[PDB]
Every structure is written in structure tokens, then in C-alpha cells.
């Protein structure tokens, strides 16, 4: 066999320890899932500094403590117009219930007459997208460091019956230690069986999202394949001028690789970007272990990644607190709070 007695015993114990950890993690999550947190601050506790992204996310500073945060501002009337009510309430509910080193932490939340506010920790290193486009492509060890954190995060989320559905470099931030933070849960859904919603980003959609058939958590493992491909190649495996042409390529599944990709990497990606759900890694009898035990991850110490004891390959430049130099610039619209309360009934639970 591939493992002698010692290595076999070690791997089996590690995999049982994961089960033990996830059982406790799920009990913790479900407690907060059932009894959420609300209205833990108000607007005038913060000074607005700068727009980090676009509703809109702004760097703010806590007046009392001087701590910096990223505050997401949603216009209640806009969310209603876009039929986003359920999406927004669910994002807040998820963020206040989960807990994992690579998931952004919601520190405060509140609402006023016009807006909903989610105040999260400030992740100063900017988006992965920025650094990927800046250096072109990541070397395989670099790409693997990020990928391992996504694998652990999806293992955690999937144990809670959460499907993520929004993976892409634009939605992954780099923290001051060089580790990844996942932030956007507007498309996540808690569902045990199949679901059908057409949502996500074209380059990252699994075939079974595109096609009318139902799908399950395995779409996230397809999206991991897309992410790892894009990190290591510098462009995604399926693209074209228009989303319709992208979907046609995805459903064909004919994937080609750069000549510098290792054989281990191509083998992993062929098993993740697998159109046949009966064969896709992450969807088989052995679950996530088919991925974590793949040769491309042989040098990955999963506990050490989780414990954040691995040296990161890239450490963002931080010129002090409140430095936004790793983010793009956006036009600054003033925050307006109406005399009159808007859509109060629809957003009671926030």
C-alpha cells in the first residue's frame, strides 16, 4: 500500500480528530444560528474615513477605542428593489454565527431609518485579485498556501450545511499576516440536500449550476478548482467575451493547462473540474479527504495552517493603522439618513 503502519495510523487519527472538531463546531454554530446578535452599536460611534469597495464598504474608526473597522452599508430601499431582502438578512445571520480563522469577523451590527450596517474587522492587505493581477501568477507553493485555507474553510462551512457559491479572488482578502479572509456571504445558503438557484460569477460556475438540474455543496469544490487554476496560471480555465460563451465552455468541460503546471497540479484540477458528479473530488465516498490527501497537498501541514503557524509567502505592506494603500479608490457619496423610517417591517430581524 501507499502507507506503512505508522503513516496509516497517523492519517486515520487526524481524520477522526477533524470529525471531533466539526461536531463541536456545529453545536457552537447552531446555538448562535438559533439566537442571533443584534443592534450592538450605532452610527455616531464611528468616523467614516474612506470607501474600501462597492452597497458600499467603508473604513471607519471607533471613536471611543480608536480601532479601525470595515463597515458595510446597505440601502434598505435598494435591497428591496433588487429583491435582496432574504440575501441580506441571511448574510448577517451567517456572519454572526460562524467562527473560523479564515472567515471575516463581524464585530457590530445595527440599522437606522435608511440603512443596514455590518461592522467587520478591517483586513488591511487588500483583495487577492489585486495581488494576483499585480504579479501575474502565483508559484505553486504560494497558490497551495491559499488553497489549503480555502479547503479548510469549505470543510468547516460544509459541515454546517452551508454552501458558499461566491468564491473568486475578488472575494478573498489578505490579512496583515498574509493569511486569507473570506467576507461575502450574500450568496451562501444553508441547505442539506439539493438547491437550484442560478447565482455566482460566470467563470466560477459549476456546470450543474448553469444547467437546470439541481446541485449541492460540490459546486464549491468545482469553484476551488477554478480558483487554484487561476492562481497558478494567472487566468481562469474558462473565459470568453460574453458569459453565454463561457457557459458553453464550462459545460463542455474540456480544460487545458499551461505548460508550466506540475503533473500533480493537473491531476488535482482534472478531479476538481470534473463535470461528472459521480467522479468529482469532494463529492465522493471519501469526502474532503480525497482533496486533502492528494499528492499536490503532500507538503501541506493542515493543523499548522489552521493554527496560523506556517510562514506566509506574501506579507502586505502596512504603513500604520488605517492605511488603505492596498485598496483601490472610489468616489465618496455622503451617507444620508432619512427623517422617515424605510422598509421597517421587512428588516425587523436585522
Amino acid at each position: 500500500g501507499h502507507m506503512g503502519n505508522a503513516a496509516a495510523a497517523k492519517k486515520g487519527s487526524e481524520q477522526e480528530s477533524v470529525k471531533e472538531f466539526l461536531a463541536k463546531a456545529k453545536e457552537e454554530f447552531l446555538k448562535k444560528w438559533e439566537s442571533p446578535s443584534q443592534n450592538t452599536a450605532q452610527l455616531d460611534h464611528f468616523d467614516r474615513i474612506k470607501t474600501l469597495g462597492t452597497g458600499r464598504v467603508m473604513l471607519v474608526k471607533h471613536k471611543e477605542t480608536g480601532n479601525h473597522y470595515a463597515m458595510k452599508i446597505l440601502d434598505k430601499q435598494k435591497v428591496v428593489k433588487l429583491k435582496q431582502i432574504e440575501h441580506t438578512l441571511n448574510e448577517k445571520r451567517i456572519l454572526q454565527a460562524v467562527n473560523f480563522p479564515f472567515l471575516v469577523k463581524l464585530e457590530f451590527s445595527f440599522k437606522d431609518n435608511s440603512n443596514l450596517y455590518m461592522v467587520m474587522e478591517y483586513v488591511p492587505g487588500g483583495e487577492m485579485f489585486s495581488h494576483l493581477r499585480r504579479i501575474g501568477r502565483f508559484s505553486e507553493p504560494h497558490a497551495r498556501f491559499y488553497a489549503a485555507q480555502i479547503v479548510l474553510t469549505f470543510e468547516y462551512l460544509h459541515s454546517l450545511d452551508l454552501i458558499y457559491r461566491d468564491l473568486k479572488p475578488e472575494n478573498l482578502l489578505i490579512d496583515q499576516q498574509g493569511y486569507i479572509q473570506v467576507t461575502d456571504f450574500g450568496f451562501a445558503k444553508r441547505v442539506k440536500g439539493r438547491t437550484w438557484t442560478l447565482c455566482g460569477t460566470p467563470e466560477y460556475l459549476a456546470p450543474e449550476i448553469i444547467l437546470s438540474k439541481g446541485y449541492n455543496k460540490a459546486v464549491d469544490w468545482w469553484a476551488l478548482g477554478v480558483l487554484i487554476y487561476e492562481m497558478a496560471a494567472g487566468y481562469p480555465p474558462f473565459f470568453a467575451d460574453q458569459p453565454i460563451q463561457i457557459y458553453e465552455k464550462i459545460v463542455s468541460g474540456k480544460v487545458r493547462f499551461p505548460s508550466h503546471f506540475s503533473s500533480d497540479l493537473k491531476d488535482l484540477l482534472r478531479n476538481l473540474l470534473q463535470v461528472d458528479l459521480t467522479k468529482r473530488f469532494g463529492n465522493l465516498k471519501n469526502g474532503v479527504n480525497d482533496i486533502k490527501n492528494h499528492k499536490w497537498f503532500a507538503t501541506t501541514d493542515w493543523i499548522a495552517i489552521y493554527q496560523r503557524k506556517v510562514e506566509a509567502p506574501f506579507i502586505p505592506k502596512f504603513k500604520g493603522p488605517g492605511d488603505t494603500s492596498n485598496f483601490d479608490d472610489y468616489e465618496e457619496e455622503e451617507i444620508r439618513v432619512s427623517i422617515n423610517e424605510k422598509c421597517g417591517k421587512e428588516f425587523t430581524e436585522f
Binding site: 473568486k168 455566482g200 494567472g234 473565459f239 467575451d241
Partner: peptide, 18 residues
Amino acid sequence: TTYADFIASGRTGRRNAI
């Protein structure tokens, strides 16, 4: 090359959800 096709696709910037 594949990269040049990617540049020519116009989808090299930030991508929006559908």
C-alpha cells in the same frame, strides 16, 4: 496564446456576479 486571448476577452478586471 491563451493569455493573449484572456487579455482580448475584456474580462481581466473585477468580475460581477450574474
